Amino acid sequence: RVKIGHYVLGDTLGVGTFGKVKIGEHQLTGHKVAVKILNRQKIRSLDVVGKIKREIQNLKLFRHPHIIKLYQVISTPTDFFMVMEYVSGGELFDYICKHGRVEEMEARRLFQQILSAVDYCHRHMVVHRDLKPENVLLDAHMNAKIADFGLSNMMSDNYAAPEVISGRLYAGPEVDIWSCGVILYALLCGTLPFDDEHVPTLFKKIRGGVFYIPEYLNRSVATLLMHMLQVDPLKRATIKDIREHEWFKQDLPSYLFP
């Protein structure tokens, strides 16, 4: 049984290809952390050590109320221990899959926190790492948190942008907006904007750029979504295009874009 300070490592929160994430618990106060364990032998084998090393150093600097905070890194000759903030409310996509669509006012609130987080990354993240929906979580207070814990791989019971699926070399921040578009749709509707049992038809839809907007959504939010999910990146919204929007400006806390 591995121990770090007063934190005793127990349950496995999520497993990725590079390593595992085990939840540790303070024995005295009951405070929880998330520890990403990265085996040296496994990551030398996958030849990704440098990339990870630099990702950690970058993350050390980060300071955002909606991105996962790295407290300290413990480096033993065999493993890397990344002690990070603990999240208790699981995935956002699982919450939507389980408890239906989100009330409009809450959909906006979560989306404001998410875009803020993506904006921080585009500003400070040196080499671009694409935003993935499975990396948007929820804390005890129902706030969105961006973390790489690999919960979607754990089992108990839209896919990619039009330029991504076309196989060309794409601009990351542009694909992130498209990715933020599907999340907003997921929030407001409870389903994914491009969805079909027949797979080749799914990609046709994504490349076609035509989707369904339910009658319960106003033109305002619909016209933001129609702008975020444009196939041609040259016409696709930027973060500031979203920030100047009628629907997005409403009840926006001024701290999210300082």
CATH-defined superfamily of the largest domain? Transferase(Phosphotransferase) domain 1
Radius of gyration: 19 Å
Total of DSSP H or I helical runs spanning 4+ residues:
10
CATH architecture of the largest domain: Orthogonal Bundle
- The CA-CA distance between the termini, in Å, is 44 Å
The structural domain count equals 2
* Structural class by secondary-structure content: alpha+beta
Main sheet? Answer: 6 strands, antiparallel
Strand content: 15-25%
Describe this structure as you would to a colleague.
This protein has helices spanning 40-45, 49-61, 92-99, 104-124, 162-165, 172-189, 199-208, 219-228, 239-243, 246-249; strands spanning 3-4, 7-15, 20-26, 32-39, 70-75, 79-85, 136-138, 144-146. With 258 residues, the chain is an alpha+beta fold. The protein has two domains: 1-86, 2-Layer Sandwich (Phosphorylase Kinase, domain 1), CATH 3.30.200.20; 87-258, Transferase(Phosphotransferase) domain 1 (Transferase(Phosphotransferase), domain 1, Orthogonal Bundle). The strands form two sheets. A six-stranded antiparallel beta sheet has the order 1-2-3-4-6-5. Strand 1 (3-4) and strand 2 form a beta hairpin. The chain is globular and about 55 Å long. It is classed as transferase. Keywords: Signaling protein, Serine/threonine protein kinase, Phosphorylation, Nucleotide-binding, Fatty acid biosynthesis, glucose metabolism, Magnesium, Metal-binding, Steroid biosynthesis, Transferase, Structural Genomics, nppsfa, National Project on Protein Structural and Functional Analyses, RIKEN Structural Genomics/Proteomics Initiative. It forms a monomeric assembly. Crystal structure of kinase domain of Human 5'-AMP-activated protein kinase alpha-2 subunit mutant (T172D).
